[PDB]
């Protein structure tokens, strides 16, 4: 462009989207108005639990839970690891992370933080999946 | 209040208010006597200037008015 063009309008960079929009919103009951606050993790209440058929190429059933977070946003969270404790009205803690197999999931459930009891029988990567040392 | 000294300063301040308000009102009734008499262009105004200036400078010494205000008021009155 010409310099006069660049002065009449300077540049404008790209509008960045977050991987994790719902972690980046807080709530106050008083105002009843969402408040932008960068957050790593949120807790919620499992509305629904179920299985998913993932994309091509894959075919295994994937465990998800539809959660209502603390801030009121309804979110689908993958339940990683072998087996789980969860059911309806179960409280859950939620971190970000995208299940590439599965279309509508963008977040994971931290395993071992709350009523998400740790995985059974696991020995390796225990800090993930939330088993104590035996 | 709730501190021992706050109630004391409320007392002190109401007292000082009563006093300094009386003194201001007297000053200003003086100044109005002067300006009315000067509007009427009478004989008494030349003593009333003095009465007003006495009370202005006395108010200064009592602290209820600042000296540039007193000076300015003497100036504006003298201008009548």
């Amino acid at each position: 462009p010409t310099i006069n063009q660049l002065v009449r309008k300077p540049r404008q960079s790209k509008i960045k989207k977050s991987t994790s929009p719902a972690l980046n919103k807080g709530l106050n009951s008083f105002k009843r108005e969402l408040t932008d606050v960068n957050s790593p993790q949120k807790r919620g209440v499992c509305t629904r639990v179920g299985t998913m058929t993932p994309k091509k190429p894959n075919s295994a059933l994937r465990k998800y839970a539809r959660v209502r977070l603390s801030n009121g946003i309804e979110v689908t969270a993958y339940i990683p690891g072998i087996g789980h404790n969860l059911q309806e009205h179960s409280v859950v803690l939620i971190r970000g992370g995208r299940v590439k197999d599965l279309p509508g999931v963008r977040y994971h459930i931290v395993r071992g933080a709350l009523d998400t009891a740790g995985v059974e029988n696991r020995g390796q990567s225990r800090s993930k999946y939330g088993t104590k040392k035996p | 209040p709730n501190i021992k000294s706050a109630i004391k300063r409320v007392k002190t301040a109401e007292t000082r208010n009563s006093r300094n308000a009386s003194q201001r009102s007297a000053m200003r009734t003086a100044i109005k006597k002067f300006d009315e008499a000067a509007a009427n262009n009478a004989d008494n105004a030349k003593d009333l200037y003095v009465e007003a200036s006495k009370k202005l400078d006395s108010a200064v010494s009592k602290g209820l008015i600042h000296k540039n205000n007193a000076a300015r008021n003497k100036s504006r009155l003298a201008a009548k």
Binding site: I3, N4, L6, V7, P10 | -
Partner: protein, 80 residues
């Protein structure tokens, strides 16, 4: 003495009473893309007698405030 600010410019209007408005017109550097930009800034000059006129080159200098907007004064009339 300490010294005051002085500027030069051009007159745009005369409708006001005993004053004018002097527009100063300076090139200056755009902060990022480096080009020179015509920066303009008008001030109210205190014209003691409605001397100047529209189209007049003029010099002004600052002083105490004289109205809501004025802070300057006519110093010379450099060129009609």
């Amino acid at each position: 003495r300490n010294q005051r600010k002085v500027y030069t410019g051009r007159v745009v209007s005369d409708k006001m009473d005993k004053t004018i408005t002097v527009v100063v017109e300076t090139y200056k550097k755009h902060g990022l893309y480096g080009k020179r930009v015509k920066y303009s800034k008008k001030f109210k000059a205190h014209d003691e007698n409605n001397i100047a006129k529209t189209g007049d080159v003029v010099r002004i200098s600052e002083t105490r405030p004289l109205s809501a907007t004025k802070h300057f004064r006519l110093l010379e009339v450099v060129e009609e």
